[PDB]
Nucleic acid binder design. Sequence first.
DNA 1: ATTATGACGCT
DNA 2: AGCGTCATG
Length: 430
Amino acid sequence: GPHMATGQDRVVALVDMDCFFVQVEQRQNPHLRNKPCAVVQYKSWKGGGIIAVSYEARAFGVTRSMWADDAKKLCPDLLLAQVRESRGKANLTKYREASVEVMEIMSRFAVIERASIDEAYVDLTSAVQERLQKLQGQPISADLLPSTYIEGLPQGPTVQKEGMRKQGLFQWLDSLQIDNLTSPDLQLTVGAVIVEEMRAAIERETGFQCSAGISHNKVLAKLACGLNKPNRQTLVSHGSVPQLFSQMPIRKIRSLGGKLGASVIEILGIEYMGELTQFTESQLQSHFGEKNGSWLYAMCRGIEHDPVKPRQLPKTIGCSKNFPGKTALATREQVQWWLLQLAQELEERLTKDRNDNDRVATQLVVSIRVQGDKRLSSLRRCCALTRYDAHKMSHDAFTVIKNCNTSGIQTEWSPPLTMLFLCATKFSAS
DNA sequence: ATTATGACGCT
DNA sequence: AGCGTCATG
Ligand SMILES: [Mn+2]
Ligand SMILES: [Mn+2]
Ligand SMILES: [Mn+2]
C-alpha cells in the first residue's frame, strides 16, 4: 500500500578490494602481477597458511585457510608472498597502511564506514541528490557505467560475458524514468555512476582494483558486491530482490553464515532467503528473538535500516599470536617475553595512531587461551591503559593473567598458553 | 596447527 | 565487565 515502506530511502555502496593483500604485494613486486599468487603467514608448518589468493590462483582451487604446501599441489606454479615478521610474529603494517590509502580516497566522495581492512560502506544518498540536480533530467549514458552489472538483467525475449553485461545494462537504462528525481532506481543508477568514479580514482591513485555493490542498504550492497568479482560493480535494485532471494541460500546473507542461519534453516525447514517471507514478524521474533526476527522479516523483503556509521578508523588496535601444538608457552619467562613482544608492537602502532588521528586509548584488554580449551578465548580481562609504554603494558597484562597459572611452581606455566592477545580500546580525543 | 585481527550483541 | 558470534585479509 501507500504506507508499506519499501526501504528505498538511501543509496548505499560496499567497496571491497579484490584479493587485497595479494594486490598490495603485486604492486610492490611486479613479477607477481597477473600470476597465480597468494599471501602466506609463516613458512615452517606446511609452507605457511594462505590468507589471500589472486583470482588466477583461485581458478586452480587455491583458497584462504589452505596450507601453502597443499595449495602448491593444486597449483605448482603458485607464487607466494610472505607477511612481514617483526618481534617474532606476523606484522600486518604494510596492509593497514595500504588500507588507509584507499579509505582516504573513498572519503573524498562520501562519508564511509570502515567495515574491515579492505572494505568500506558508503552512504551515497546526498552525493546522489547533488549529482541528480546537476544532471537536470539528462539521461544516464551506458558510457558512464563501463564496469556495472544490473543484477537480474538481461531478462525476457551473444555468448560473451561483456556482451551480457551490456545487454542487461541497456535493458536497465531503457526502463529508467530519468525525469523522476525521487525514483529509487534512478537514484541507485546515479549512485553506480559515482561508484564507477570512486573505483576509477582508487585504481588511478593506488593501483588497486576493487569490486562494489550498490543497493538501498548495507546487506544488499554487500551481497551485490560479491555477485561479479573481480574488478566489477553490481547494482541490486529493490525490484531485483524477489528473484535474487528466491534461490539464495540463507547463509550467504551477512550475519546468517553461522549458528543463527543454521537455526533459521533447521527450525523453519527452509533453504532460501525468499522463503522467509511466508512467516509473520511475530513468528520470526518467536524463534530468533525480537531484534533478529524484525531484522529477518524486513531483510527477506530487501529492507534493512542499519546506518552507514561515520567511522573511517578502527575502534580497537590489537596484537594477537597463537602458540599451537608444541609451541604453547609453558614457562613464565616465555609468557613474559611474548607479552613484551606483543606490547612492543602495540606501543608502536598506538604511538603512530595517536600522531595520525589525535586520540589515545584508555583500556587494555588481555585475552589468553589455555591448552585444551576449545573456545578461541579462554579468558578476557581489562585493565587501565594510562601510558603508551610496552614494558608497563606487558607487566600489567601479566599481572592481570598471572592468576590463571594453576602450576604450584611459579617458574612453570600450567596449563600452557596457546594464544596471547593485547587490545587497546576506549579511545578518547586527545 | 585455520592465523591475526576487528565489530558487535548478550547479560 | 566478560563472554559469545560473525566475519575473513
Ligand atoms: Mn576483498
Ligand atoms: Mn573484504
Ligand atoms: Mn575474501
